[model samples]
Target chain A: DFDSLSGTSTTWVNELGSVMTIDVDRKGGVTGYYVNNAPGTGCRGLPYDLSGHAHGSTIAFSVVWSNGIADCRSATSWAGYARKTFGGGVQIVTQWSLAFVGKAGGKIETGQNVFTYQAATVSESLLTE
Target chain B: DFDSLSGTSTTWVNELGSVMTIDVDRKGGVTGYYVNNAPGTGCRGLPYDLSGHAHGSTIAFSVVWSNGIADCRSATSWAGYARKTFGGGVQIVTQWSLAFVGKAGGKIETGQNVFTYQAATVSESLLTE
Candidate 1:
C-alpha cells in the first residue's frame, strides 16, 4: 500500500544545489521537513500541525505554524501545501503563504513561496546513526 | 486496524489543569503537540521530529529537537517518549529529557520532566475554525 510510504525518510536537492530532508511516520505524515542553503544558513524550522493523505502513488499534505512577525511580538501564521509523486523517484512541489502583523502597527503583510524538489540519496550509514 | 488511530486529534489535560493539545496525522505521526499554562504563560513549542507506532489499544512514540540552550547559543537537544492507551478515554504518559550547555560555560545541564494527561472535550464549533 502507498501508506507504506510512512516511516520512510528521503533527501532532495533542487537545481540551485539546495538540500532538503523529509522524514515521514507510519501514516505518511511528515515528522520533519527541512530545507537549508547550508549547515545553518538560511535555516528555519516549520513548527506546525500538518497532515497528509495518500492516493495510490501520490501524497498530499498541509501544515501551519506561527509565533511573531518582524522584530515585534506581533502575531504571524503560515500555511502551506505540498504534493508528492512517486515513480522511479519521488518528486514534490510545495506552495506556502505567510501572514503577519507589522511590529510598528500597520496592515497585515502577506507573502508566498513555491518550490520544486527532486529526491536524492545519502549514505545508509548516516541514516542508521 | 490500529493504523486507524492516524488522523485523529485529541486534547489532554493534566492533573495541574495544564492543557495539552495533540494533533495526529494520517500516519499516527504528531502534527502538533502543545502544552501551555493558560493562554501563553510558560509556553514553549516542541519543534521536533517524532514518530509513533500503535499496538492494539496502545501507542508508543519518541521525538527530539534542538537549537541552543541557556543564554548562550550553545547547542542543546531534547529526546523523549510517550505511551498512550485507549479505553473509555485516552490516557497518555510522557517523559522527556533536556541536555544543554550553560551560558557561563560549565558542565552540561541536564533535566527531565514527566507528566500524565487525560483526554478532554472542546466545542466542535471551536475546532472547525
Candidate 2:
C-alpha cells in the first residue's frame, strides 16, 4: 500500500495577492500551493509531488488553471523518472501527465498546452544522495 | 470611450513548469501571464496593469485562485484612478471590483475570496507624467 506521509505547514502572503503554503513531512515529502488571481488566467502549478518513496524523496509542485469554461492540470517528473528539480534547491518527481477535463466555465478545451520542469531538489538529504 | 492599446509580444519558457511572455508597445501598456501547472492550484494575477494614460505607468500585478469549483478575478487601481506601481516600474488607475462566477468546475461557489494588488505601473510615459 502507498505509505502517505504527514507534517506541519506554514503560509505567507505577499503584496501580489500571492499566498504560498509549505507542508513538510517527516519522511521528507513536501507539498503545497502558490495561489493568485486574474481573468482569462486562473490557477497554475498544483497537486505537485515526488515519486518513488525513498530516502531521496524531495518536494515537487505544480498547478491547474481554468481555460475559459474549461480547466487543465499538469506536472514534471524527476530525473530518470524519479528525480526532478526546482528553484531554491527544490526537486520534483511528477507521477502523471497533465489532465484536462470538460466541466463548465471549468470545462476543458483542446489544443491546451501543458507544462513542467526539472530543477534543484528541495531536500538536502535527497540531493546529497 | 476607453482607448485600448496594442503591441508586439515575446515569450520565454523555463524548466520549472513556467512560461513567461513579454509584450512591449510604443505607448507602453504591458500585460501578460506567468503560467504553470499543479492541481488544487490555479492562475494568479490577471488583467494586471498600471493606472493613468500619462507618461509613467509601471507594470503592476496580482492573481486569484478557485476556492474549489468557483472562480474569481481582480485588479488594483492606480495612485488615484490612474496611478499604481509594479516591478520594472508599472502603474495603474482606479478600478471597479473583483467578480466571481458560478458557471459549473466552471461553476461559481459561495464564500470565495477575491483579490488584487498595488504594484508598479506598466506604462512608462504615463508614469513619468
Candidate 3:
C-alpha cells in the first residue's frame, strides 16, 4: 500500500455514479464536497463541504450544513480506508452516518458506499439529473 | 385528483439520478426492482424485487434480497405519497428504512429521496457511470 492521500484534486465515484471530490492539504487535512442528489431532502443538490483528515490508508471526513447556506445545520461523516486494487487502481470503501440534526428525517441515517477512484469527473450541472 | 397507478411500466428518477421502474399489477400489487448501485454492499446492482400496494397518494413497497441470488437477505421499504404539481407533473416522496438483516454496517439505515417523473430513461448500462 503506497499510502498517503496527498493530492491537489482527486475525484471519486460510487456505483450509482455519485461523485466526491477532495483536495488534500499535505498534513492530512481534506477539503472537498460530497454531491449526490436526493432532492426534496432540503440539501440534495448542493455540494456538501468535506472536513476531515487522512493518514496512510485511513481517512475520515464530515459534511455539515443542511443546505450550504448555513441557514440550517446537520452533519454526516464518512470514515474508511483505501484499498489498492489490481494493477494501479484504488477504492475508498466508507461507512457514513447522517445525524438527524438539521432537517427532518427525524433519525440518524447510516449507510455504506464505495468510492472508486475516477481520474476525471464532469460538471455538477450534469448529473443523470 | 385523477388517482391511479396502474400502468404497464413507468420510470421515475430521484435527484441523485438513481432510477426505479415499476409495473402495476392493476390491483395495487406493484412489482419492480429498486436498483441504485451501492456496490460492496452484499445486495447491490441486482434488482431487489418490490412488492407493495398503491392507492392514490399512499404507496408502499419493500426490497428484500441481499443480491439477486437470495443467498443473503436484507430489506428496505419505501413508504410515502405522490404529490401532484402544477400542470401535469408529479413527484413521489418516500422515506425508506434499510433493515440490518443481512449485511454488516448494521443498525437500521433510514433516509429520504424524492423521485420525479421522468418520461424516458436510457439503458441501465448508460448511468452517469
Candidate 4:
C-alpha cells in the first residue's frame, strides 16, 4: 500500500482547535507553523515556528514561542506516527512534551494529541481561473 | 492526510502473474525482486533484482535480467505514482519501458501495469511465541 502525507501546506487540527500547518519535503524535512487557539494566552493567534523530520510514517517536530512575544517563552516538542483508521481516514498520534514555567522553576509537562486532516479552502487564484 | 506505504517486505502482484516483492526503507530506498511468470520465457521462474526509490507516493525502479540466464538478458524501467483507489486500497500505476531483442536489432517496448497488495502466509514462528 502507498500513502501520501498531508498535502503540501495543508492544515491539520487537533482537539483544542489548535492547528498545525506543515509542508513536508521529499527528503523527509518538515517546515511549518502552529497556532494555539486557546484564548487569553500570549501565543494565542500568534504563529510559532516549527521544524521537524518525517519518514516511514514517523514524524517529529518542535515549536518554541519566542520571548519577544509577550508572556510567551516556552517550547514544546512533538513526536508521532501516522496511522490509518479502519474507516479509511488518516490521523497522527503524537506525544508532546511542553516546557512550562513554575514558581519552583522550569516544569515539564506531557500530553497526547491526535491531528486529523482537515478540509482546506481552495486557492482563490485557482477558483477565479 | 497521512499514508503508510506497503508493509515492510510486503508483496505486490501485478497482471501476467508476475510478482514484485518490495521492502521499503525510511530513507526512501526500496529493494525487491521481480519474478516474471510469463510462460516459455527464459526469465520465467527466476527472481531478478529490483531496486528503486520512493517518496511522497512517487516510486521508480529498474530490474535487469541476468546475462547468465538463458534466453533472457533484458532490462526494464518502471516509474509511477502510487494512487489511492476509491475503496481506500493502494495501487501502483506504473509505466514500464522494457528492452527487447529483435531481428532488426534492439527494440524498446512500453506498457502499463497496476500492482495490488497481496496477502501472504502468516509466519508460523509467531504462533508458538
- Residue pairs whose backbone atoms clash in candidate 1: A27-B27
| Per-residue lDDT of A88 in model 1 | 51
* Cα deviation of A30, candidate 3, in Å: 0.7
Model 4 quality (TM-score): 0.44
Q: Which digits, one per residue and each the tens of the lDDT, describe model 2 over residues A3-33?
A: 1234544443333333345455667554555
* Model 2 lDDT at residue B31: 51
Error of 2 at B84 (Å): 16
lDDT, residue B17, model 2: 36
Instruction: Give me the candidate number with maximum lDDT.
Output: 4
Q: Candidate 4 at residue B10, lDDT?
A: 69
lDDT at residue A56 of model 3 (Cα atoms): 48
TM-score of chain A of 3: 0.75
- Predicted candidate 4 versus true structure: per-residue lDDT over B1-129, tens digit per residue: 012553477688777778998887764556678888755666777787666555454455665555246435445556555556698677676656554444464344556668887867666596563
Clashes of 4: 2
lDDT of 4: 0.62
RMSD of each: 19.3, 19.0, 18.7, 20.1
Tens digits of lDDT, candidate 3, A29-108: 56678776543455655675555545445555555443325323334555555667799999876666544422333344
Ten contiguous residues minimizing lDDT sum, candidate 4 chain A: A1-10
- Candidate 1 residue lDDT tens string, B3-114: 4556775555555554445566654444344333434323234332233333222232332222122121111112222334555444443222122223432122322333
For each candidate, report its DockQ versus the true two-chain complex: 0.02, 0.02, 0.02, 0.01
Off-target runs (Cα >4 Å) in candidate 1 are A1-129, B1-4, B38-87, B104-129
Error of 2 at A15 (Å): 28
